């Protein structure tokens, strides 16, 4: 019959359906710019070390909660990027690269050096400089705006955000303590801490639990939530991590 020509064409279709074309690669639509090669090397490194912990734990499956970003605003085109940590400190990444981190009293003023990566300067709000007066006006505006109509909350040093990157599927946060946090369009979140060994999961309804990664991989899924597509989400993390680990010049 002509079913032979049909069955053969069918078979070739199934083979081709197992390969890719027009497949999405991670593209950053927004990220803070780092004007230091050394700063990038430190970032790239941290991505590699943390990735290694994932991969080591991936080939090897056969509880302290990390600091996280509770809310954020990418206003990069106007004022700058803002965020709030589980410590309820507020940071603002200014478009020049500098940062002001106001504690829960005082604030840190951060920027980077071509010879020393990141540089920080602690101040008292009492003793704030006149030159940094506009910065804290912007922080004050971000602090109040974020309180009013952004929603989330969390329950041994000062931590700031070195790098954020917004992809279509998720926004990725690189904190200064080596923690990585991923916010998915699924409204599911997870944070990778402690060299890649520990994984934290935050729910759409804001339930958060920290678990060893080996265990979670022993489960084959986060224990509470089956709706969370963990395998795919851990794959995106890995793709995101690897991409950054090679960004060492700009």
């Amino acid at each position: 019959a002509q079913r032979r020509l049909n069955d053969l064409a069918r078979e070739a279709r199934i083979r081709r359906a197992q390969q890719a074309v027009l497949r999405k690669e991670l593209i950053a639509t927004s990220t803070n710019v780092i004007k230091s090669e050394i700063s990038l090397r430190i970032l790239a490194s941290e991505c590699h070390l943390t990735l290694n912990g994932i991969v080591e734990a991936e080939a090897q499956y056969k509880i302290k909660h990390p600091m996280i970003v509770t809310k954020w605003v990418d206003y990069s085109n106007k004022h700058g990027f803002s965020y709030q940590l589980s410590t309820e400190d507020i940071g603002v990444l200014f478009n020049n690269g500098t940062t002001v981190l106001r504690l829960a009293e005082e604030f840190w003023y951060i920027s980077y050096d071509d010879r020393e990566g990141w540089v920080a300067s602690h101040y008292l709000l009492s003793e704030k400089p006149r030159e940094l007066s506009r910065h804290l006006e912007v922080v004050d505006f971000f602090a109040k705006y974020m309180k009013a109509n952004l929603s989330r909350v969390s329950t041994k040093d000062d931590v700031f955000l070195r790098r954020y990157t917004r992809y279509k599927p998720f926004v990725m946060f690189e904190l200064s303590d080596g923690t990585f946090q991923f916010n998915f369009k699924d409204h599911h979140k997870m944070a990778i801490s402690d060299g890649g060994k520990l994984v934290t999961y935050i729910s759409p309804s804001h339930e958060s639990t920290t678990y060893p990664l080996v265990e979670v991989l022993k489960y084959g899924e986060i224990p509470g939530y089956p709706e969370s597509n963990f395998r795919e989400k851990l794959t995106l993390i890995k793709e995101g991590l690897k991409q950054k680990s090679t960004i060492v010049t700009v």
């Binding site: 927004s30 954020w72 990418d74 206003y75 085109n77 952004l150 929603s151 916010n183």
Partner: peptide, 7 residues
């Protein structure tokens, strides 16, 4: 302009 989940 983008942001996290609203209140």
């Amino acid at each position: 302009l983008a942001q996290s989940s609203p209140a």
